[PDB]
Design a protein around this ligand. Structure first.
Ligand code: ADP
Ligand code: ADP
Ligand code: K
Ligand code: MG
Ligand code: ZN
Length: 678
RNA sequence: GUAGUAACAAGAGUCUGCUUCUGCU
């Protein structure tokens, strides 16, 4: 309720009407600073003008959190405060919420769509726009789509633009190596948001430092297993699988050779590149093309899972890596299970007895995992009230760590929670926002559930109880990530421990510390510039971007991406709402089969009904979903990643991961056209 | 369906990833 002195300081450039970037630590009260700026803004409007304020948040939970904050603060003062996100875009009309509210809180895509659809024509409808996590204003991020529009209006110079406020804990350094390059990076970000001043705590630092304690860092380098018989057995299986592939087809006319760097990210990326090349193989004999493509698809999928298991074993237990394989092979056994699949499964099952034996050898436990357990034991022994956030990179690793921490509870009583990002498409892994909230509620209040294991979903945004320990388990990243994760343990006495067996990860954390100091010094040098100097720099970058932006601004058969069977013509596709690609006609119904959808999501007016698969029982490739839409109970919606495209002109096959390059040649859905097909 | 100056990169004479992760609609 009562503003801190550093908060009044941070607010000053914005109160004086300048577009301002507030750079200050996570949890230091930047949102409250924006509230101060808003109060002043409302009270100092020129005559005949009423303020209209929009607050943008990148994440639905942050939208909800900040909407509640603005409601509580400003409704008592007679102000109308409303929110729009994807949830309520079905009920809500955007223009009318804007008309009726003094403050709108939104996710940015809501606005983008309302410009796209002509509902909104000018950003001059707002007098103040507040960008939470404004460092996201880059590329084709929704933030940068909106600011591009702002700058297009600014260039046409026939309108009053809203004042801009950006909130961030880190402006970043980009790829800079020195203070000069860092300054350029920071001016770049400022240029995208039309910033006129950067506001940091400079006069009231000792107050700031009282509220925000940088957690104490520990970087622990640990050893790998002395011997790795599990890795040797899997690596040999991988070698044999590559040799099998080469007997099926000379893949080195299609992709390069592997370096046999099994169990690395480089090998992963190699498999995925090789998969792409294999699926684009073309032969005169279409039967043989299908047979070879399918076989190579299978070989590469198997190589991938072995590579995955190696990586799991490096970070977790042998039994975790083995579990992952046995669950994969169960899936293989229940699928098409063609001869090649039976063979690969039998080759694994030959080794399985020995692998099981290896997985019970306690003397070869993962040293990194042992260190992690010692860390947690020490923490909870010292302070039973500890709450810990344990970060790890992959869904698979977080799942393995959950299993470890549940089978073997810390001090035989601490229980883990798990937080992952949302399940995408058909993923059994992943969590809805309600599930996410449930986990965090338990973590916040439970007596024994005092450990949260998380992917990057926990980095920032969603409200999490303060943690006095944060453990980064092989969890490296850039200086902005470093800075954000600090906000999870910003309580006096908090600690942050990084555990790795990799000297590169240690070196990475050293470089982050150097970058953060470089970033802070660059900001200081920029703040010595007068307004004239700053504005001239930002104008120059804006014109460069304008000129770049300006100088940028055939019929195909779709074939199953696995077995190469004919699916449909581009002529048959219709686009719904610029996004969803349906296929018309009776012919196409012969080409696919369906099963009930496991998770009947709704979105953009569709009821998900079924999953859609290649009709070839020896293939069963996932092609998309079927939906109900309007008066139509059964529409197939294809996903571009499931197919290879073949030019009816050249006969050449191509790969597309987005529809963008193709959409131009496709017709839009027309309810009248559709209505006539029944 | 789409985004990321997030991950991890590997390549091409500043451009490129569909992988990892997360976000949004
Ligand atoms: O190409 C896909 C899209 O047109 C549509 N779809 C699926 N998921 C989404 C989300 N999250 N937002 C917008 N549009 C979506 O469905 C097409 C098929 O995708 P997929 O087969 O992966 O759907 P799924 O239900 O996840 O299996
Ligand atoms: N002056 C203040 N008095 C009381 N609580 C404050 C004050 N400033 C910030 N807080 C609290 O600190 C927390 C973090 O503030 P927030 O604005 O969300 O931080 P940031 O946006 O910098 O991450 C919030 O719960 C907020 O209520
Ligand atoms: K068939
Ligand atoms: Mg990197
Ligand atoms: Zn198929």
């Amino acid at each position: 309720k009562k503003a801190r002195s550093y908060q009044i300081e941070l607010a000053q450039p914005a109160i004086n009407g300048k577009n301002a970037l507030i750079c200050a630590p996570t949890g230091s009260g930047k949102t409250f600073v924006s509230i101060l700026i808003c109060e002043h803004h409302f009270q100092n409007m020129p005559a005949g003008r009423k303020a209209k304020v929009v607050f943008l948040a990148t994440k639905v939970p942050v939208y909800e959190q900040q909407k509640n904050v603005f409601k509580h603060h400003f409704e008592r003062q007679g102000y109308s405060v409303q929110g729009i996100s994807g949830e309520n875009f079905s009920n809500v009309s955007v223009e009318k919420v804007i008309e009726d509210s003094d403050i709108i809180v939104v996710t940015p895509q809501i606005l983008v769509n309302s410009f796209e659809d002509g509902t909104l024509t000018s950003l001059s409808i707002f007098t103040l726009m507040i960008f939470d996590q404004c460092h996201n204003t880059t590329g084709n991020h929704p933030y940068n789509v909106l600011m591009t529009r702002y700058l297009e209006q600014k260039f046409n110079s026939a309108s009053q633009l809203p004042q801009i406020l950006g909130l961030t804990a880190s402006v970043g350094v980009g790829n800079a190596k020195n203070i000069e390059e860092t300054i350029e990076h920071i001016c770049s970000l400022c240029s995208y948001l039309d910033i006129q001043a950067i506001s940091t705590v400079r006069e009231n630092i000792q107050e700031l430092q009282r509220f925000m304690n940088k957690p104490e860092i520990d970087v622990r380098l640990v050893k790998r297993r002395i011997h790795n018989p599990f890795a040797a057995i899997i690596s040999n299986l991988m070698s044999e699988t590559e040799a099998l592939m080469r007997t099926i087809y000379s893949v080195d006319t299609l992709s390069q050779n592997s370096k046999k760097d099994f169990g690395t990210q480089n090998y992963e990326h190699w498999i995925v590149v090789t998969q792409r090349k294999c699926r684009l193989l073309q032969l005169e004999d279409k039967e043989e093309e299908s047979r070879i493509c399918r076989a190579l698809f299978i070989c590469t999928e198997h190589l991938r899972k072995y590579n995955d298991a190696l990586i799991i074993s490096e970070d977790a237990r042998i039994i975790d890596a083995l579990s992952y394989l046995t669950e994969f092979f169960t899936n293989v056994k229940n699928g098409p299970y063609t001869e090649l699949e039976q063979h690969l499964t039998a080759k694994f099952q030959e080794k399985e007895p020995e692998l099981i034996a290896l997985s019970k050898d306690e003397t070869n436990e993962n040293p990194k995992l042992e260190e992690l357990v010692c860390i947690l034991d020490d923490a909870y022994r010292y302070n039973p009230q500890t709450r810990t956030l344990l970060f790890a990179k992959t869904r698979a690793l977080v799942s393995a760590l959950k299993k470890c921490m549940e089978e073997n509870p810390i001090l035989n009583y601490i229980k883990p929670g798990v937080l992952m990002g949302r399940g995408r498409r058909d993923q059994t892994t992943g969590m809805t926002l309600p599930s996410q909230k449930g986990v965090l509620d338990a973590f916040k209040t439970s007596k024994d559930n005092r450990l949260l294991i998380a992917t990057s979903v926990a980095d920032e945004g969603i409200d999490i109880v303060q943690c006095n320990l944060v453990v980064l388990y092989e969890y490296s990243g850039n200086v902005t990530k470093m800075i954000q994760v600090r906000g999870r343990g910003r309580a006096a006495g908090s600690k942050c421990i990084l555990v790795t067996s990799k000297t590169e990860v240690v070196e990475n954390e050293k470089c982050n510390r150097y970058k953060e100091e470089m970033m802070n010094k660059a900001v200081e040098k920029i703040q010595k510039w007068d307004e004239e100097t700053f504005a001239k720099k930002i104008h120059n970058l804006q014109m460069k971007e304008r000129v770049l932006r300006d100088s940028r601004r055939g019929q195909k058969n779709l074939l199953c991406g696995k077995c190469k069977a004919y699916a449909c013509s581009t002529d048959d596709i219709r686009i719904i709402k610029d996004s969803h690609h349906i296929v018309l006609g009776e012919a196409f119904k012969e080409r696919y089969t369906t099963k009930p959808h496991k998770k009947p999501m709704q979105f953009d007016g569709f009821e998900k009904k079924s999953k859609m698969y290649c009709r070839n029982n020896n293939c069963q490739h996932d092609w998309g979903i079927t939906v109900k839409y309007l008066t139509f109970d059964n529409l197939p919606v294809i996903k571009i990643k499931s197919f290879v495209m073949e030019s009816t002109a050249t006969g050449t096959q191509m790969d597309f991961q987005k529809w963008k390059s193709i959409n131009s040649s496709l017709k839009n859905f027309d309810v009248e056209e559709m209505s006539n097909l029944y």
